[PDB]
RNA sequence: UCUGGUGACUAUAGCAAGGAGGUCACACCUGUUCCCAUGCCGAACACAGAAGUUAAGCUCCUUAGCGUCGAUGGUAGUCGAACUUACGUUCCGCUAGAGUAGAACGUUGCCAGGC
RNA sequence: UUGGCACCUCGAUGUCGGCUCAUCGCAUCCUGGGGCUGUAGUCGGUCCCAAGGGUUGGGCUGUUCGCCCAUUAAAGCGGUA
RNA sequence: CUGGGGCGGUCGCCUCCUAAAAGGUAACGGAGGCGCUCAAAGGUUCCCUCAGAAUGGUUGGAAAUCAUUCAUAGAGUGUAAA
RNA sequence: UAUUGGAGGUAGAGCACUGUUUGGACGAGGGGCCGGUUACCGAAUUCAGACAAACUCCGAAUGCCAAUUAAUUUAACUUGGGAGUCAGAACAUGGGUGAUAAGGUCCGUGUUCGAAAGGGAAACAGCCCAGACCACCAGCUAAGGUCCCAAAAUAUAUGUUAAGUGGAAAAGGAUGUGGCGUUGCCCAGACAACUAGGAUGUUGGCUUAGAAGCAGCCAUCAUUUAAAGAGUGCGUAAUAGCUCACUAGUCGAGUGACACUGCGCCGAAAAUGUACCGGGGCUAAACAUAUUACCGAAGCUGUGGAUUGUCCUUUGGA
């Protein structure tokens, strides 16, 4: 429950997003009490490992910059054909 | 050319050139139709009248401005400063 | 899962067959499911063939849910007629499908039996398919 | 900000619930003789009166059950382009609907008595 | 094949059967090679390789076709205005 | 007019969709109406709000009328449709 | 064109309305009966699903109308004289019709041909590139290309195919081959045939034509045992049962499965002569991803020359 992420930047076009999804990572955003609207990206495999480790709900340590955010998955996106995760939403409880 | 096969729907009317007739910002003279309609897609507002055919025409000279009435209804206005 | 009991307008413009599944992309009722990967029509008669195959192969075992209903009517002109003179009469009922549209769902039966049943259904069906389980995680 | 008119805003303004309060304003109330009054009631409407009482309407305060509003990120779609004949692919702008976080039990103008 | 389209031909591209002459494809009728079989061999059925050659004479209809009478190892299916 | 003529159908007006979110837009394309009616179903002034649903009942073919809280108009608007 | 302001309901979504629909709750009406009960069946009411040219609580992109207005361009309107046109075509894209048929037919929106020569597409009005005033034995490029026919790379780097794929199809079929994961097993030694044992009370029970791994209910008990099943299993007249449940040991490294992909294979038969690369031919002269050259037009430059127009007068040059 100690997943890390990387900070997204502005104006990520269609090509950038689809390349990013075609590598082993997936974009996401965080929000909620205790933080602001930060857009990040996580590596898919470790997300899946964490989720099967904790399940649907889990107070997860999330790696952004230097600060770890107690966060749980509000909700998520999936591609049924070509099985691959598409966008994860995260809310912080703290 | 086939034969006896015939259809019971080959009929229509002549379309009426309804819809807008002026745009926000242009100078209309009084009497200018702004929006030919049926029923009230747009109600008259300030210095605007309702014809018998639900037509909307300016009462006086001025610029034309489309606006909101409440939640789901629109009106029309005309203002004279020019 | 054959025909709509009544429709308002019986002669209708044919359906668009270009794009992606508007919905029904998930297993909701059953446990395992069968989705499509191309996009053809389904004619209210090939799904009938398919549900029979599955049901009779499970020997009246677990439950089945058909997820595609043939809503659209289609017309065919009478034989040896020229072009023109109206639109023809209804020949069958269809339901367009899209890549990703789940078609059939099953539950209350082992995994291998379900996979075999959906396989046998796939061959009575004009679209490439895929075996899927209730999405979780 | 009280209190009552009046009107300006996309219900962030509403419904339901709980709880106050009648500061002389507000409704309730006594009656039909008085103009009037109702295809059919002093019901209402109108009217003369103010002895009863806040219980309800009203007012104020709480609460998001309920209503509405509602991003960011994205996805669908598509303008232009380049491939292409594929139920297509790529690039570049624009960018929904749905959903999720959330806003929200109003803001406000003039007037008259208030304090 | 029955059609659909109306693109060349109406200052004319003779249209159906038969006769003479053929020529080419093979999804092969016989003949040659095989796998088989619910093939003991003769029998048949099925599929594969095979187009070199061969693939009748009559009765009835203008008939193509089809039926019938005798045979043959077989009496093949089509293209060629 | 006509997916060659012929036969059948059609011909003027209104509404809807096809029609690609201004307007316009064709086929022997998909659906329907018109050749009227109203001395009130016109003008104006003042009043009033509906269908259905249950908690239902003298009738109760069920629901006639009557009652009561919700009814976003789900009703009505002379007629086709918008 | 940039920036504001606005009308409208298409694509997409959605089910709030009209409908069309798949499962699941939940009480109940005529009615199974004696008003009945219970099944249900016609709905009421919910929860999860979906479908729509003539459904819409919503709603783009773009088009359109106009502006206090900018910036770049050069048309625009009015009146009069003269006409020709009312058979269109194909491609691309949004739709109807037909059969998600046609080199079909009817609309919308481009382009081109018509009325357009030139280069590419073998040849080939409509495709791609590009508009020919007239020379020139000058130069640069676009689409297409660079082994020979035939001007230019037998270029460079890194990978892919083995079918002449390239250089016509499809559902399906496959230990063809390359990549990226995921994975359950393995020196305690999984996986092979590892030639090592293979049967017991016992078909016990229904024992069925008698049938003791076969016409069918299996009740399928512990192990003689490193490894074992009222027999993994080939059988059907009972049956004759070795081998991949299973590993010490022949001995010693690996070996099931899964995804998601890149390129091939099969499916694949037609009529004069190869005849589905234009020919030769090609294992790169195919494909993918980069990079650098060069060829290539009547395009665009260079020089000379007409002929008109608008400017400077440079009455000459632009
Ligand atoms: Mg001649």
mmCIF file of C-alpha atoms (C1' of nucleotides) in Angstrom, chain G residues 153 155-156 289-292:
data_model
loop_
_atom_site.group_PDB
_atom_site.id
_atom_site.type_symbol
_atom_site.label_atom_id
_atom_site.label_comp_id
_atom_site.label_asym_id
_atom_site.label_seq_id
_atom_site.Cartn_x
_atom_site.Cartn_y
_atom_site.Cartn_z
ATOM 1 C "C1'" A G 153 21.216 4.584 -53.701
ATOM 2 C "C1'" A G 155 22.991 4.052 -49.717
ATOM 3 C "C1'" U G 156 23.592 3.693 -44.078
ATOM 4 C "C1'" U G 289 11.676 2.371 -38.173
ATOM 5 C "C1'" A G 290 15.089 6.112 -38.522
ATOM 6 C "C1'" U G 291 18.910 9.011 -41.374
ATOM 7 C "C1'" U G 292 21.440 11.090 -45.810
#
